Amino acid sequence: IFKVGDTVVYPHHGAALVEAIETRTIKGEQKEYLVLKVAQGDLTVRVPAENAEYVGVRDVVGQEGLDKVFQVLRAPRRYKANLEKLASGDVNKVAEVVRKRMLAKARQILVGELALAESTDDAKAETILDEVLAA
Amino acid sequence: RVVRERMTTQDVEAITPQTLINIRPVVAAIKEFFGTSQLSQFMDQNNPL
Amino acid sequence: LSFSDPRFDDVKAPVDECKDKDMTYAAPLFVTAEFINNNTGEIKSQTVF
Numbered sequence: 001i002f003k004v005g006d007t008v009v010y011p012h013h014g015a016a017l018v019e020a021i022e023t024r025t026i027k028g029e030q031k032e033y034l035v036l037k038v039a040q041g042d043l044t045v046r047v048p049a050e051n052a053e054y055v056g057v058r059d060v061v062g063q064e065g066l067d068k069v070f071q072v073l074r075a076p077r078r079y080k081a082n083l084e085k086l087a088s089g090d091v092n093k094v095a096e097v098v099r100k101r102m103l104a105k106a107r108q109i110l111v112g113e114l115a116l117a118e119s120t121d122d123a124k125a126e127t128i129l130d131e132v133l134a135a
Numbered sequence: 136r137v138v139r140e141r142m143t144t145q146d147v148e149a150i151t152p153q154t155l156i157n158i159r160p161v162v163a164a165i166k167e168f169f170g171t172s173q174l175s176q177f178m179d180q181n182n183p184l
Numbered sequence: 185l186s187f188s189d190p191r192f193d194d195v196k197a198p199v200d201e202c203k204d205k206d207m208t209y210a211a212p213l214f215v216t217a218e219f220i221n222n223n224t225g226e227i228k229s230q231t232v233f
Contacts (some may be wrong), residue, residue, distance in 0.1 A: 012149050026225060032224075043151045044229045051224045055148070138185065148226060152219045155185060155233050169208075 001035055001059050002049040007116060010057045011089045013038050013045070014109065021044065056068055056089050061117045069095035069110065074135045189216035 001008060002018075009015040016036035016091050023030035024046065032049035047057070072095035084092045091113060097106040111129055115122035136157055145154070169175050191214040202209050218229040 013151075031225065039152055041151075041230060043153065044227075046227045048225060051226075054224070142185070148221050150215070150219070151228055151231060152185065152217045152230050155219060156217060158233075 001053055002032075007060050008036075008052075009060055009113070009116070010036065010038065010045075011055075011087070014040060014112055015042070015060065016045065021049070051095055058089065061091050061113060063118065065091050066114065066117050068092050069113070070132060070135070073097055073132050075099070076135070112121055186218040186220065188218065191215065200205060 002021075004018070004020060006018050007015060008018055013036075015023035019035050021038055022033045022035065024033045025031065033046045034049050036045035036047060038045065047055070069091055072092055076126060078098040082097055086097055086102070086106060089096075094106060094110060094113070097103070098110060107126070107129065108123075110122060111126045114120070114129065115125045120128070139156055142150070142155065172178070188192070192216070193212050195209065195211050197205075197209070200211065201222065214231055214233060216229065217232045220227045220228055
């Protein structure tokens with residue numbers, strides 16, 4: 001998951017292009033700090049490689065995960081926990097949210113999940129999410 | 136002061152310095168110094184001397 | 185939260201044009217503001233306008 005040139009998706013900040021690994025040491029302890037070039041406003045993040053799986057930043061999903069969010073979209077308190085359902089990290093729990101600002105973040109991060117699992121030409125592919133809106 | 140009081144109200148490990156930073160008092164301080172201060176005098180030019 | 189490296193670009197408008205069109209002579213200001221959460225060590229660096 002944690003190598004050079006990967007595409008590892010932060011569960012809150014979106015997907016980042018990791019460029020390099022740095023052993024920037026914390027008092028003699030060369031922690032495997034991994035860089036993160038999230039292309040939102042380029043808030044460059046150096047996270048440890050060991051704490052990366054602690055915080056749960058995970059690799060991109062596949063076509064089976066795409067079909068999983070598709071079948072969640074097939075069948076369309078509550079409001080507080082469904083915002084927390086975005087904070088789970090499971091891609092089948094993100095697609096339950098889309099089935100008012102919380103609905104805005106859930107739709108755009110699914111297309112970034114859609115157009116990087118399949119690599120199919122992003123935010124114009126939000127229109128592709130509008131096709132499976134009726135499902 | 137606003138930044139230090141607002142980081143408490145924000146959540147943990149989910150914020151960015153762009154969300155942290157409010158440059159409104161800095162730019163307001165600059166403009167309220169350039170206007171409304173007797174050390175920023177009107178330029179007095181009858182002649183080069 | 186860590187501040188570093190102030191930076192200036194060039195101007196936004198020339199002198200006489202700024203004088204005629206009634207604004208203030210100016211230039212953009214940039215710093216390198218960095219936030220770290222050292223609960224486990226998690227830096228985030230931007231270039232804040």
